[PDB]
């Protein structure tokens, strides 16, 4: 977690449930990453406990998430002089989208009790709209390189953490040990506890 900083100054690293300064000593597993874009006026909307229009119908963040995001300004990656209309978003939904649930929406949303599945020219509204990425909107509408990272402290063997090297095993002295991210103080001795290796 040290090659992460060569991608311009960031509008992120405000981390809940994890310390951004200490990212190598702790060990965990099962890290999931997703990639999308944000407008810019709602960078802080990607947070647990926040519910509005953004991150309520596209990607809802759960209250118990213990993770954070990385994000910075995109001025040359995808913003062009002719504009960019690559990304879309969901306008209307029947209810709040459950977190960690990928969804697709192309069908026509209705705002009444009349039958409407594909009929236009009425109050039925298309639930998608095209992002206009232009340099003329400095803060209001700008592409961003936002990526969400998810972490969990499940009862699983540790897989991904810092590249810090190990040391030689020592016995008969009570010290602090870091065994697969488990912090504790005690003495290490040969154990007579023998069980099935599972």
């Amino acid at each position, epitope marked *: 977690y040290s090659v992460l900083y060569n991608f311009a100054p960031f509008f992120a690293f405000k981390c809940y449930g994890v310390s951004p300064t200490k990212l190598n000593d702790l060990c965990f597993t099962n890290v999931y990453a997703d990639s999308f874009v944000i407008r810019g006026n709602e960078v802080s909307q990607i947070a647990p406990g926040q519910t509005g229009n953004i991150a309520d119908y596209n990607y809802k963040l759960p209250d118990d998430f213990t993770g954070c995001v990385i994000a910075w300004n995109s001025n040359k990656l995808d913003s062009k002089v002719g504009g960019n209309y690559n990304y879309l978003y969901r306008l209307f939904r029947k209810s709040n989208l459950k977190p960690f649930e990928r969804d697709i929406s192309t069908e026509i949303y209705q705002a009444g009790n009349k039958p409407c599945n594909g009929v236009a020219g009425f109050n039925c509204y298309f639930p998608l709209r*095209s992002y206009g990425f232009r340099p003329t909107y400095g803060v209001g509408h700008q592409p961003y390189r936002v990526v969400v990272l998810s972490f969990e402290l499940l009862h699983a063997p540790a897989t991904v953490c810092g590249p810090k090297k190990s040391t030689n095993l020592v016995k008969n002295k009570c010290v602090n040990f870091n065994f697969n991210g488990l912090t504790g103080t005690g003495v290490l001795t040969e154990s007579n506890k023998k069980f099935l290796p599972f």
Partner: antibody, heavy 126, light 109 residues
Framework: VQLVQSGAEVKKPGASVKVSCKAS????????IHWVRQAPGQGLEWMGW????????NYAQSFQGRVTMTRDTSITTVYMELSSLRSDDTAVYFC????????????????????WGQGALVTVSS | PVLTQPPSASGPPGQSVSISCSGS????????VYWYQQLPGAAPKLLIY???QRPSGVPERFFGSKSGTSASLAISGLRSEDEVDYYC???????????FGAGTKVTVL
């Protein structure tokens, strides 16, 4: 501004002809480009689209493998070939451009041909 | 495929002529239809797109809107703007591409 397309004269059916589209004024690295042809006595028929920045290529349902769409930023032009031309599908080719930059099916709803580059009317005769 | 529109549309100036663009379910209603007017030997021109906002230099007298499974357009005043055919432009998933009209041959009378 407006675009140009270099065509050929009347040739025999059953051969290969190479066309080109060269941009003018603007930088040809930001604009999605389309293709379309108009049969004599009939409306326009959609062909497909590419982009001169990446390997995104789509065709119509009738000419999926008949033509090859090539791009090259260094010469700043786009070539297509027509292998074994018939006597019905030969038509004027519009080097149409669309604003923005995408290659998604759902993106095509908010894409319109803002300006139309004039092309060459090509025909075939043995 | 090909759209069904009456090609032999004509009439004396001073009245209103209405043309309707037939289409399938995925072509009109789930997408935004456009209208292209083309000239022989030159580039076409844009008049109606998304049926609610107009380009620069396009007169307000052109009227094209959708109200169901088939969009419709109406013309009024045949002096120069109705001297050449129009095209019904839409998008659908039947061929994963844009569709064009067959040509509404309207001249000046």
């Amino acid at each position: 501004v407006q675009l140009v397309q270099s065509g050929a004269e009347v040739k025999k059916p059953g051969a290969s002809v190479k066309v080109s589209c060269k941009a003018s004024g603007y930088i040809f690295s930001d604009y999605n480009i389309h293709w379309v042809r108009q049969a004599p006595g009939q409306g326009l028929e959609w062909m497909g689209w590419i982009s001169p920045d990446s390997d995104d290529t789509n065709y119509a349902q009738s000419f999926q493998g008949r033509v090859t769409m090539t791009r090259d930023t260094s010469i700043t032009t786009v070539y297509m070939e027509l292998s074994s031309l018939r006597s019905d599908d030969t038509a004027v080719y519009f080097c149409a451009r669309s604003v923005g930059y995408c290659s998604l099916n759902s993106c095509q709803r908010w894409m319109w041909f803002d300006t139309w580059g004039q092309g060459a009317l090509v025909t075939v005769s043995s | 495929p090909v759209l069904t529109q009456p090609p032999s549309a004509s009439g004396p100036p001073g009245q209103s002529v209405s043309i309707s663009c037939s289409g399938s379910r995925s072509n009109i209603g789930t997408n935004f239809v456009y209208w292209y007017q083309q000239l022989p030997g030159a580039a076409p021109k844009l008049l109606i797109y998304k049926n609610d906002q107009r380009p620069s230099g396009v007169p307000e007298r052109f009227f094209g809107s959708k109200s169901g499974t088939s969009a419709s357009l109406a013309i009024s005043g045949l002096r120069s703007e109705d001297e050449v055919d129009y095209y019904c432009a839409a998008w659908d998933d039947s061929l994963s591409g844009h569709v064009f009209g067959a040509g509404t041959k309207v001249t000046v009378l």
